[PDB]
RNA sequence: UUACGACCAGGGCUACACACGUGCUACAAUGGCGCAUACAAAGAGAAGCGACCUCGCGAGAGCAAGCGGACCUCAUAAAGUGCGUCGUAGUCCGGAUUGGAGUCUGCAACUCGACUCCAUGAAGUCGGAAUCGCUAGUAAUCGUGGAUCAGAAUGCCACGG
RNA sequence: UCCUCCUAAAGAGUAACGGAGGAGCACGAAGGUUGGCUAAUCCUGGUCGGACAUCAGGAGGUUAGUGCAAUGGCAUAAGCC
């Protein structure tokens, strides 16, 4: 969807996540960018992503590796 | 006259009987009369029993009606299940393809109700 | 008929082999195919039975014998006496020649087929079935019908419990999940 | 009172070319009509030339002789 | 049998498409060339085409060459 | 007026038991789908318009001349006409809604873009009380263009048949 | 006025403005015979179809039925065809 060649991803986020492999399991990651996508070597670990106002935690799976953080955040609230 | 589900209907064009199958359309439906060579003006009521056969083994190279909707629900079902943003509109019977709310979308609801 | 002549002396002899028999009767063996449906909404009209019992006659080459209400229910708006259903008891080579023509010619004809479900046994070795669509056979024009009549198949055997009662139909190639 | 149904295909009866003929007589020679939806029709005439067996040609009881009668599609009659 | 109350049972030639000549007696006073049997039975290939649903990861890599 | 000002990132203005206004596509045969074939006006273009060629089923991707423009590009106009199929069906009408693949603009398309391919095929079979526009190249119908604009029109402003 | 049960004291009968319900009919088959048959209810399995419809096999054994009350009976059926 985004374009044939070159997903489109974050820099501050990447280097946090080879880092939370550097150091395994540990607290959730606070996070913003909800314009990132997920990969592969990201699974078991839990990312505080913003859905506006706070930090709506996660436990990521196999499946959510051709999606972005975003969706797993729903922006508002109903009934 | 039968072809991977059903062919229910005779007594028309072949690149249009075709059609009742659940995963070809009108453009499917060419190719695979251009493959077989069968000309479209033909009639399935007239058509030779040498040539259905050439016609069922087509849809042979292409998912059809029967696993295609296993295909389909297993995947709405995967999103389901995943709680995603697509998801939790199919759980709900809400748009998922950033259309309108405020007045809209009658297709995905239903009739009205006060 | 043409599965009979096998059954006497092969289907003998792959279960007194593998299940451990001395006797060619403590093999199990199959004796009536019931077969019926009940059309439930014949309330508005009698020809909803009148056409429907020449279904199971145009399946089984035997006239069906109608069923009724054995109690009056309140819910379902029924009382003692209304032809609710017709019902066909298969015996002999009929049944062995229904037997043929369903494992065959039938059974790969329904619709979304990821073969057939094996936990719908009674304590007793006995098989039900449904087809939910009886335009499976090749006995139904498509022109004929007005409705999406189903049936129920209840195989009915000398088995002394269940787990044999796979057996004896998977000896018969029964497309068993 | 009456219980009205769906609502029936545009066209119920259509029959060109339909001429149907009893031994001596004639019934109808060369018949070319059309009935529509939500349409009233009158049948009138003499004794016995033909009314009864007109809707017996309609609901298909006997056979025309040639000229074929197509029936409408949602009937409920 | 009740002498002629059940319909006709005529002896039919079940010819299926691919071979699999048959023969048989049935109650449609017709013959007929059909489509497959229980011999040519799709039974196992679509058994086995069940894995098509599942994964995300290998989807990934073929769409990742940057 | 050490915050009713200033900077940053994420979200919202895109919600949804419903009610109203204004429009678009239609419920088909004065038509839909195919094949070849016609007759215009007006306008825009330099971190722009983009040939020809090649490749891609298609959006388009590569190379790439020309034009500050009566010079080159957007620019193939569509209704029309000629032949063929459809024979009044929820249909070869309807093109909503969902599932897959993709193309692009843009740091970034999930909340929230447009377009394309394959599939799916929903209401809808002329609309209650009631109400609207219009007197001649007008009404009705057919396409074209422009501004805003990185991208984004069923609107607006123009132009012809 | 007539029928059934209790009071009514283990034969019959036995009262009260004592305690509870019914009848003023129906049926040319719902009668006579000759054949044949056996329910309620729950469990398990099965298309729609469900707490309860039709179907299959298990437990159970008359807890069912009887043209209409109650009592007594009824499988040799007095029930069903
Ligand atoms: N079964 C039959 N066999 C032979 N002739 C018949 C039959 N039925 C009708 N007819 C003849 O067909 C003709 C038309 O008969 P039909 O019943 O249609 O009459 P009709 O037009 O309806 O008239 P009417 O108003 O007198 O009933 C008559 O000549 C009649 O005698
Ligand atoms: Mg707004
Ligand atoms: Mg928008
Ligand atoms: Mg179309
Ligand atoms: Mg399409
Ligand atoms: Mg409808
Ligand atoms: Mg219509
Ligand atoms: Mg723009
Ligand atoms: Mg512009
Ligand atoms: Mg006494
Ligand atoms: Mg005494
Ligand atoms: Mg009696
Ligand atoms: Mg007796
Ligand atoms: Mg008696």
Not at chain 3, 15 to 39: A, D, W
Request: glycine letters at 8%; aromatic letters at 6%; one cysteine or more.
């Amino acid at each position: 969807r985004s374009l044939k060649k070159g997903p489109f991803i974050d820099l501050h986020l990447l280097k946090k996540v080879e880092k939370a492999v550097e150091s395994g399991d540990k607290k959730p990651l606070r996070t913003w960018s909800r314009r990132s996508t997920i990969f592969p070597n990201m699974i078991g670990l839990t990312i505080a992503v913003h859905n506006g106002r706070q930090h709506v935690p996660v436990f990521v799976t196999d499946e959510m590796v051709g999606h972005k953080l975003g969706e797993f955040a729903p922006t508002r609230t109903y009934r | 006259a039968r072809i991977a589900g059903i062919n229910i209907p005779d007594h028309k064009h072949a690149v249009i009987a075709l059609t009742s199958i659940y995963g070809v359309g009108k453009t499917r439906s060419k190719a695979i009369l251009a493959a077989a060579g069968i000309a479209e003006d033909v009639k399935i009521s007239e058509l030779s029993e040498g040539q259905i056969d050439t016609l069922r083994d087509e849809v042979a190279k292409f998912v059809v009606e029967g696993d295609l909707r296993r295909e389909i629900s297993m995947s709405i079902k995967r999103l389901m299940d995943l709680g995603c943003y697509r998801g939790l509109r199919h759980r709900r019977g809400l748009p998922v393809r950033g259309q309108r709310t405020k007045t809209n979308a009658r297709t995905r609801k239903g009739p009205r109700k006060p | 008929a043409k599965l009979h002549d096998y059954y006497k002396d092969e289907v003998v002899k792959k279960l007194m082999t593998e299940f451990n028999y001395n006797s060619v009767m403590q093999v199990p063996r199959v004796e009536k195919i019931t077969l019926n449906m009940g059309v439930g909404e014949a309330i508005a009209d009698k020809k909803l039975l009148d056409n429907a019992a020449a279904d199971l006659a145009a399946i089984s080459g035997q006239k069906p014998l109608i069923t009724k209400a054995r109690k009056s229910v309140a819910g379902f708006k029924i009382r003692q006496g209304y032809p609710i259903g017709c019902k066909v008891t298969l015996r002999g080579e009929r049944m062995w020649e229904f037997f043929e023509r369903l494992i065959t010619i039938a059974v790969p004809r329904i619709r979304d087929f990821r073969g057939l479900s094996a936990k719908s046994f009674d304590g007793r070795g006995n098989y039900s079935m449904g087809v939910r669509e009886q335009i499976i056979f090749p006995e139904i024009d498509y022109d004929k019908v007005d409705r999406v009549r189903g049936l129920d198949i209840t195989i009915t055997t000398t088995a002394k419990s269940d787990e044999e009662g796979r057996a004896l139909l998977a000896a018969f190639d029964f497309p068993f999940r | 009172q009456v219980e009205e149904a769906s609502r029936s295909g545009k066209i119920v009866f259509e029959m060109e070319d339909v001429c149907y003929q009893v031994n001596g007589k004639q019934l109808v020679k060369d018949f070319s009509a059309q009935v529509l939806r939500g349409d009233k029709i009158a049948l009138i005439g003499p004794n016995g030339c033909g009314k009864t067996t007109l809707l017996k040609l309609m609901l298909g009881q006997l056979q025309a002789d040639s000229g074929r009668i197509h029936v409408g599609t949602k009937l409920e009659v | 049998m009740k002498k002629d109350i059940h319909p006709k049972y005529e002896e039919i030639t079940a010819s299926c498409s691919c071979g699999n000549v048959m023969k048989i007696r049935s109650t449609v006073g017709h013959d007929l060339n059909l489509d497959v049997c229980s011999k040519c039975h799709p039974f196992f290939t679509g058994k086995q085409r069940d894995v098509a649903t599942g994964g995300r990861v290998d989807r990934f890599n073929k769409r990742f060459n940057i």
